[PDB]
């Protein structure tokens, strides 16, 4: 190679820089995969858990993180960087309500998160937070939205989302899935959010190995599903 | 200077000198008439003289593909710009960073 | 090697970063100024005159800085705009303090102390900019000065700096005038000098620039003269060239 040894955050003669694009493979040491789907008035997060020990608890494992009453998120990547990322998200959501007097849009929150990650690329002397964040929320006169924020400081909004280890396989499914014209009537959404992940990993859980966050324009509160109603939808797509 | 006593440079030639070398190599060539060799050497700001031959070969090469023996002043006007060749420095950002 | 910051000294012993900066001025444009009684002038070279540009400023090398001084520029554009914004702000600070214009030398020493100070404190890049000075005062009249990346300066009667500005000084000494220093004698000398440096034939008026500074009834006007009147100055030089070979 030309071989700058990429020790700090400077350029290469090819034109790119390697330390930030080493953080994209820093997500993959979580050993995890997450999916968000926006089809209609509802939006669904789905993510598996991995409990390796019986001494380890169950309630303190969940990656679903409630940011505000109407905005929830899911975190991938390594664990310790993910929770500190959430603390800035909870903090700056409350400064919006204080400064501006109304509830923050889900679109504006990813601009604030990505700009914090941008400074760590532009200015040196802080490790750039190897974790990824996926949001959901309801916006009036806009419907529901799904956003992803990258460690580079990139964000975009899009319908079907994969993160973790198996992006390219799961996104290959959803292109084949979301090319037709469906109406996604809240059990159409949850079923595909399972069955996009239910071509990929070849697992078979009894219904206690995932988490599902949901939001809906009938109750815009963020909502983590019950183990019983997870079992309901797991045999409702499923005859 | 105990060993080598004369150290002699060789600059690229002048317009009169580019005129003269052109006269040397076009001697055996077969010029038409009405042709100005002075303006041809005016078209070379900083030639070597090993490429004044290259003009004389390519002008004769243009007549060869026609199965012809003639020449024009315009044939040299094409051959000078053929021999002279630049980098054509792109994007102007390098060139104007550095004013 | 001794490739580090501006600190340190080499053994034997000199300063390589200053030498790399001062040598790199030879890759810049070309600027010069001449002797004159009752006036002073500057001349410069348009680089990169590709046809998809606008020239919305019509004044690029020249920066009228106070009211009766201007300057050329040569070097990195990034460092060039920093100094010109600084140097105009020096002169108004003096004028606020005394209500009298800055007398054309201690302006220069004020900048050269700033340009010096990045060579001693680390870790800063020295300014890779050299530039000239023209001006009039109460104490000496018309003047010329020569800035350096080191922070050194000097007062000249005719000088040049830039791309091929090592042989242009030889023509200045070959055509040195003294006593006779009129502007028309000085303008006619300037177009001949740029003809030697620039290898572009016939010397298009879109490739040069001429700015003058005269003294009229207590005003000290500054003229950046337009492309229409460069034409009578070029063809006059073209006329004098064809007439000069009639003796042969």
């Amino acid at each position: 190679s030309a071989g700058f040894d990429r020790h700090i955050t400077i350029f290469s003669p090819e034109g790119r820089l390697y330390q930030v694009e080493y953080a994209f493979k820093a997500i993959n040491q979580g050993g995890l995969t997450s999916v968000a789907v926006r089809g209609k008035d509802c939006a669904v997060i789905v993510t598996q858990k991995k409990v390796p020990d019986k001494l380890l608890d169950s309630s303190t494992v969940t990656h679903l993180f409630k940011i505000t009453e109407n905005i929830g998120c899911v975190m991938t990547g390594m664990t310790a960087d993910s929770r500190s990322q959430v603390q800035r998200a909870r903090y700056e959501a409350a400064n919006w309500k204080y400064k501006y007097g109304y509830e923050i849009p889900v679109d504006m929150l990813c601009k604030r998160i990505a700009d914090i990650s941008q400074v760590y690329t532009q200015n040196a002397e802080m490790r750039p937070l190897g974790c990824c964040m996926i949001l959901i929320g309801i916006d009036e006169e806009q419907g529901p939205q799904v956003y992803k924020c990258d460690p580079a400081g990139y964000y975009c909004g899009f319908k079907a989302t994969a993160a973790g280890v198996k992006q390219t396989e799961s996104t290959s499914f959803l292109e084949k899935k979301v090319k037709k014209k469906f109406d996604w009537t809240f059990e159409q959404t949850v079923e595909t959010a399972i069955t996009c992940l239910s071509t990929v990993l070849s697992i078979d859980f009894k219904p206690s190995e995932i988490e599902v966050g949901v939001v809906t324009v009938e109750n815009p509160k963020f909502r983590i599903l019950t183990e019983a109603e997870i079992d309901a939808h797991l045999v409702a797509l499923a005859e | 200077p105990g060993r080598i006593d004369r150290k002699i440079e060789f600059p690229p030639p002048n317009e009169e000198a580019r005129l003269d070398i052109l006269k040397i190599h076009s001697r055996k060539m077969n010029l038409t008439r009405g042709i100005n060799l002075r303006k041809i050497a005016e078209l070379m700001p900083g030639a070597s003289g090993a490429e004044v031959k290259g003009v004389c070969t390519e002008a004769g090469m243009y007549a060869l593909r026609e199965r012809r023996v003639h020449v024009t002043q315009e044939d040299f006007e094409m051959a000078v710009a053929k021999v002279m060749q630049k980098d054509s420095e792109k994007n102007m950002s390098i060139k104007k960073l550095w004013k | 090697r001794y490739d580090s910051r501006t600190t340190i000294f080499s053994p034997e012993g000199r300063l390589y970063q200053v030498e790399y900066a001062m040598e790199a001025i030879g890759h810049a444009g070309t600027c010069l100024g001449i002797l004159a009684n009752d006036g002073v002038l500057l001349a410069a070279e348009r680089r990169n005159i590709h046809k998809l540009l606008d020239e919305v400023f019509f004044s690029e090398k020249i920066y009228k800085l106070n009211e009766d001084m201007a300057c050329s520029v040569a070097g990195i554009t990034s460092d060039a705009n920093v100094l010109t914004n600084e140097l105009r702000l020096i002169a108004q600070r003096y004028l606020l303090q005394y209500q009298e214009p800055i007398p054309c030398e201690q302006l220069v020493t004020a900048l050269c102390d700033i340009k010096q100070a990045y060579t001693q404190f680390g870790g800063k890049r020295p300014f890779g900019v050299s530039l000239l000075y023209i001006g009039w005062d109460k104490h000496y009249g018309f003047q010329l000065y020569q800035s350096d990346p080191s922070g050194n300066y000097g007062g000249w009667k005719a000088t040049c700096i830039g791309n091929n500005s090592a042989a242009a000084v030889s023509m200045l000494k070959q055509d040195y005038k003294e006593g006779e220093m009129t502007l028309k004698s000085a303008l006619a000398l300037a177009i001949k000098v740029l003809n030697k440096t620039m290898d572009v034939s016939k010397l298009s008026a879109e490739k040069v620039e001429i700015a003058t500074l005269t003294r009229e009834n207590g005003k000290t006007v500054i003229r950046v003269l337009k492309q229409k009147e460069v034409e009578q100055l070029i063809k006059k030089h073209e006329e004098e060239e064809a007439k000069a070979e009639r003796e042969k």
């Binding site: - | 200077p1 006593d5 | 200053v18 080191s150 050194n152």
Partner: protein
Amino acid sequence: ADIKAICTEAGLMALRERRMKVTNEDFKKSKENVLYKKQEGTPEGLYL
């Protein structure tokens, strides 16, 4: 060896302008012709 080259070259310059005695000018032209081939690199203006 620089001095001996100057002494030979100044003698050659007198033969060029057809002489035997050697003026001051032959030593001036010998000094310019012989010496300027190596002298490269000095910080003029930087010191004083």
